[PDB]
Amino acid sequence: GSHMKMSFRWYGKKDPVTLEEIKAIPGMQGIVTAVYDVPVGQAWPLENILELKKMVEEAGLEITVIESIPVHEDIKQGKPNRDALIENYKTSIRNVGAAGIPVVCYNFMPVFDWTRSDLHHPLPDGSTSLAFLKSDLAGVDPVAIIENYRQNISEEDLWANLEYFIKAILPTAEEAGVKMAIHPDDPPYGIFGLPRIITGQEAVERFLNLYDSEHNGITMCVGSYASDPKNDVLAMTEYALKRNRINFMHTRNVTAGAWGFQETAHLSQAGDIDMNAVVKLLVDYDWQGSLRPDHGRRIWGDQTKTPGYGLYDRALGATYFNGLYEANMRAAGKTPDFGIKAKTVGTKE
Amino acid sequence: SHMKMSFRWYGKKDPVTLEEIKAIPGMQGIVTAVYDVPVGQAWPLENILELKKMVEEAGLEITVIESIPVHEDIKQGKPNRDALIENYKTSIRNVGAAGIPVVCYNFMPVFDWTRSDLHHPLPDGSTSLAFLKSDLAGVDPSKEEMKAIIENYRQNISEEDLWANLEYFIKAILPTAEEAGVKMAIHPDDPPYGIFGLPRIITGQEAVERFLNLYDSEHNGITMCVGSYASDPKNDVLAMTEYALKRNRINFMHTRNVTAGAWGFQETAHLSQAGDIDMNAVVKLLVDYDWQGSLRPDHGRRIWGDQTKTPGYGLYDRALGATYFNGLYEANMRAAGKTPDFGIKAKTV
Numbered sequence: 293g294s295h296m297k298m299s300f301r302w303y304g305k306k307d308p309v310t311l312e313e314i315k316a317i318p319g320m321q322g323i324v325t326a327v328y329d330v331p332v333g334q335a336w337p338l339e340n341i342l343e344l345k346k347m348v349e350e351a352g353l354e355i356t357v358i359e360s361i362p363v364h365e366d367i368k369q370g371k372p373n374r375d376a377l378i379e380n381y382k383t384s385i386r387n388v389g390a391a392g393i394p395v396v397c398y399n400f401m402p403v404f405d406w407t408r409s410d411l412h413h414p415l416p417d418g419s420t421s422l423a424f425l426k427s428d429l430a431g432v433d434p435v436a437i438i439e440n441y442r443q444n445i446s447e448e449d450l451w452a453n454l455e456y457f458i459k460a461i462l463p464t465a466e467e468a469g470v471k472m473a474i475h476p477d478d479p480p481y482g483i484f485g486l487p488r489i490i491t492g493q494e495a496v497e498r499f500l501n502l503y504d505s506e507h508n509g510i511t512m513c514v515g516s517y518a519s520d521p522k523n524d525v526l527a528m529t530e531y532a533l534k535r536n537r538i539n540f541m542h543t544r545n546v547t548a549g550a551w552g553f554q555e556t557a558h559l560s561q562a563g564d565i566d567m568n569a570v571v572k573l574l575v576d577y578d579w580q581g582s583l584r585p586d587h588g589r590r591i592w593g594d595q596t597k598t599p600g601y602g603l604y605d606r607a608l609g610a611t612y613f614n615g616l617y618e619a620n621m622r623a624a625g626k627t628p629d630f631g632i633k634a635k636t637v638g639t640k641e
Numbered sequence: 642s643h644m645k646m647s648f649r650w651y652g653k654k655d656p657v658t659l660e661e662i663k664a665i666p667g668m669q670g671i672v673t674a675v676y677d678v679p680v681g682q683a684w685p686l687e688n689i690l691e692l693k694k695m696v697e698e699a700g701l702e703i704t705v706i707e708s709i710p711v712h713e714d715i716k717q718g719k720p721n722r723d724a725l726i727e728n729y730k731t732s733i734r735n736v737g738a739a740g741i742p743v744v745c746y747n748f749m750p751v752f753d754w755t756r757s758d759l760h761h762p763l764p765d766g767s768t769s770l771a772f773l774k775s776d777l778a779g780v781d782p783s784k785e786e787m788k789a790i791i792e793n794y795r796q797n798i799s800e801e802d803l804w805a806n807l808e809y810f811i812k813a814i815l816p817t818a819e820e821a822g823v824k825m826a827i828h829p830d831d832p833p834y835g836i837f838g839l840p841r842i843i844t845g846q847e848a849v850e851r852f853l854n855l856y857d858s859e860h861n862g863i864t865m866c867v868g869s870y871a872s873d874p875k876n877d878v879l880a881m882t883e884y885a886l887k888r889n890r891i892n893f894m895h896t897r898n899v900t901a902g903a904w905g906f907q908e909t910a911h912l913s914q915a916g917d918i919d920m921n922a923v924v925k926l927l928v929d930y931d932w933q934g935s936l937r938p939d940h941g942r943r944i945w946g947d948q949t950k951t952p953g954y955g956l957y958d959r960a961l962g963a964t965y966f967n968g969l970y971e972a973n974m975r976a977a978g979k980t981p982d983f984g985i986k987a988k989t990v
């Protein structure tokens with residue numbers, strides 16, 4: 293039976309947005325977070341993870357997803373020493389499973405996790421947002437590693453580097469009781485001479501096949517995949533759902549074409565994704581997992597710094613998914629759940 | 642079959658701005674009134690225009706006017722009522738002289754609402770308005786004037802008297818309103834039973850049938866505030882909603898959520914499971930019947946340090962409600978076979 297927990301990204305103690313505020317989002321159940329006191333490729337201790345879990349649980353929430361045990365560039369490059377960094381990744385997986393967190397989200401995006409030309413590109417209602425203007429600058433070197441990928445490492449080398457990775461970690465994830473969920477490339481194609489392989493349906497199928505298990509699944513980030521129109525989110529969503537290989541949902545809306553892309557409000561008609569169709573799919577497939585609204589616009593006085601991570605519009609995206617999820621749950625004669633245990637504190641009949 | 646998401650704005654003085662209101666996805670209609678004319682006296686075009694101009698420039702539109710307030714003297718049926726009704730006559734005409742097609746208003750002796758507590762705690766740590774009967778048991782409610790206004794209603798004006806006062810008012814103003822294009826929509830009694838020995842008549846299904854029948858004309862309508870009605874458990878808002886739709890008699894919409902008992906009631910998050918109303922069933926019916934008019938998220942919780950001190954009128958939870966209704970709308974539309982729509986012209990600049 294279906295079981296989708298609303299979740300929200302939270303960067304810990306140093307987050308502009310707090311747990312009180314997050315907790316106040318109607319229907320919010322999960323916290324998506326990570327350890328920030330340890331360098332990339334170095335291995336997360338249990339206590340670190342546990343400190344976060346305690347903060348989150350006292351606030352009346354739970355950590356449902358570690359979003360992002362970062363992958364060291366040595367691993368991605370496929371350099372000689374990877375083995376050591378991978379043993380650290382194995383330790384991290386183990387420590388997350390030790391903490392009781394079911395999913396770990398990661399990426400295999402060489403040197404860049406994402407690219408944005410504009411972090412304040414206005415929208416037809418007064419609100420700013422992030423865009424990828426294919427015209428602007430794009431075609432200029434970002435003022436050792438780069439040339440390596442450019443000169444030496446092909447997409448198939450990256451495919452072989454990734455396969456090595458996932459063959460090395462997967463049994464650990466199995467033993468830990470933890471499911472891996474690879475985040476696609478953002479933008480979902482090669483830029484700056486750098487290669488990208490997690491880019492579309494063909495890529496997803498080849499990925500899942502590297503190690504065939506539920507513990508080896510995807511973060512269906514619909515607004516990344518559909519950043520390149522060449523991609524069709526819904527069949528992607530569905531094949532993945534048909535295969536039981538979606539382990540995390542991200543659900544931001546974006547408008548795209550031959551010209552490139554710009555992130556919009558989550559509403560289906562604000563951009564190019566049919567959001568109702570997405571969750572209708574989760575409904576039909578009795579999907580069990582977490583979804584975050586992912587990214588927001590700047591609206592109101594939102595003085596949250598960090599890119600699409602202001603509380604306000606992401607909140608406005610979550611309740612929109614409450615709507616879509618509840619309606620579709622009901623249309624299917626299913627009864628939706630939002631983790632609400634009490635309506636009131638101190639009254640009752 | 643187009644519902645236009647809307648939102649109350651309290652004029653130039655509202656700490657909520659139209660920038661902010663326009664920023665909510667899918668938000669089209671604004672909802673406001675004039676605030677510089679005492680109460681009974683006539684509403685000049687100069688005043689309603691100057692607010693319509695303030696809003697039209699902001700990319701938004703007036704869809705409904707929240708309240709030309711009926712004077713106590715009209716409510717009490719005092720002899721001096723005719724002139725007051727006069728001044729009310731032109732308000733309807735001046736407002737029709739602005740394209741604005743709906744006017745909400747109440748017929749509630751003394752107060753327009755009553756709460757015992759304006760920061761009652763909810764389980765998630767947010768706060769909301771609550772009416773708790775037992776806490777208003779002790780209380781005895783110008784100042785020397787209201788006392789005597791209360792004495793008059795208690796001792797001298799009975800329910801039937803107040804029906805009569807209303808009927809007089811209705812048959813007076815309706816042709817005036819059919820003459821101006823404007824549709825009238827009566828805000829239900831809030832709460833919908835006698836407090837402090839004062840009478841209330843707009844309280845349930847019966848009242849509805851009767852009220853409609855005072856002037857069987859599609860311009861004589863209700864504001865279906867499901868929240869006000871569900872505050873009394875004896876009421877079935879789903880049935881009440883449908884009944885009134887089959888008669889083409891919903892001219893405006895308050896979609897607020899409450900939980901309720903013999904103990905009173907408490908406003909909640911708009912999300913169904915947070916309260917006692919199945920908002921999905923509601924919006925579904927609005928869909929099934931092709932209802933055309935504007936729906937409005939009523940009160941919201943106090944969340945995220947919102948300082949706004951007008952009842953339930955901060956921006957945040959109100960907006961979180963709206964986008965949740967976008968999601969309910971869109972989903973139910975597609976589930977029918979119909980195709981939704983919001984304020985959306987251009988996806989991008």
Ligand SMILES: O=C[C@@H](O)[C@@H](O)[C@H](O)[C@H](O)CO
Pocket residue numbers: 708747753754828831
């Ligand atoms: O429940 C009350 C609310 O609807 C308020 O906005 C207001 O007091 C009335 O609508 C106007 O009298």
Ligand SMILES: [Mn+2]
Pocket residue numbers: 828866895939
């Ligand atoms: Mn109201």
